[PDB]
């Protein structure tokens, strides 16, 4: 209810306010095992944090636990990637996984790497704003897993209502930035369509993470493992 009473600017301020910290990696050359270690170690820690940001995403605590679980089980890797992409923006040709872990494209993760870099090239070429990014990030969380859902019809209904808000909020932002009506709509379209490319990177990484799993090359946390469990089941 409270999410449907927030203003455009209160929506924005609440989301910038929930923004997670940029965590650090571990501080010779990289082995295959060593590199992925840092990524999955990083990711694990970032998961713990992401769960706390979700609870501060307006509308999210209004839902039942089955449904937050399901939403987070579906969205988690998308969320991670749009963060990396967003952090990488201003480092053309590099992925800022962390401040100490800034890599270029210099098994199989290269195609994925190329996509994330292109996504960051896009955000750059669009000059994505922070307020815009946090909106997109909330959209991902509430959107990705709602399709795969009168206790239930109401909850969906709810999430879709929260989603229109975030969209109103995105529009506020662009009217405020002084864009014409035509340009608000075009722009809004352009940013929603990137999510399709993000959902695609994530589906791909999930499979790559599944082979890096079967490989036992890289320990994965019990969380990271359960979260990968959900995508098979």
């Amino acid at each position: 209810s409270l999410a449907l009473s927030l203003t455009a600017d209160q929506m924005v301020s609440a989301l910038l306010d929930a923004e997670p910290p940029i965590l650090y990696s571990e501080y010779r050359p990289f082995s295959e095992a060593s590199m992925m270690g840092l990524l999955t170690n990083l990711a694990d820690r970032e998961l713990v944090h992401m769960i706390n940001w979700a609870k501060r995403v307006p509308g999210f605590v209004d839902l039942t636990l089955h449904d937050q679980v399901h939403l987070l089980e579906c969205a988690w890797l998308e969320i991670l990637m749009i963060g990396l992409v967003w952090r990488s923006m201003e480092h053309p040709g590099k992925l800022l996984f962390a401040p100490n872990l800034l890599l270029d494209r210099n098994e199989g993760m290269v195609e994925i790497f190329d996509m994330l870099l292109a996504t960051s090239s896009r955000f750059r070429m669009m000059n994505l704003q922070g307020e815009e990014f946090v909106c997109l990030k909330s959209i991902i969380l509430l959107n990705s897993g709602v399709y795969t859902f009168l206790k239930s019809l109401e909850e969906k209904d709810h999430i879709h209502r929260v989603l229109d808000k975030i969209t109103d909020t995105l529009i506020h932002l662009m009217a405020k930035a002084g864009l014409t009506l035509q340009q608000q709509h075009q722009r809004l379209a352009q940013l929603l369509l990137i999510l399709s490319h993000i959902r695609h990177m994530s589906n791909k990484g999930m499979e790559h993470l599944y082979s890096m799993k079967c490989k036992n090359v890289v320990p994965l946390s019990d969380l990271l493992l359960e979260m990968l469990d959900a995508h098979r089941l």
Binding site: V48, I51, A54, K55, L65, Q68, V69, L72, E73, D222, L223, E226, M227, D229, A230
Partner: peptide
Amino acid sequence: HKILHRLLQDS
């Protein structure tokens, strides 16, 4: 299934 369940309750 369950770790995530418990993080979403933790306060």
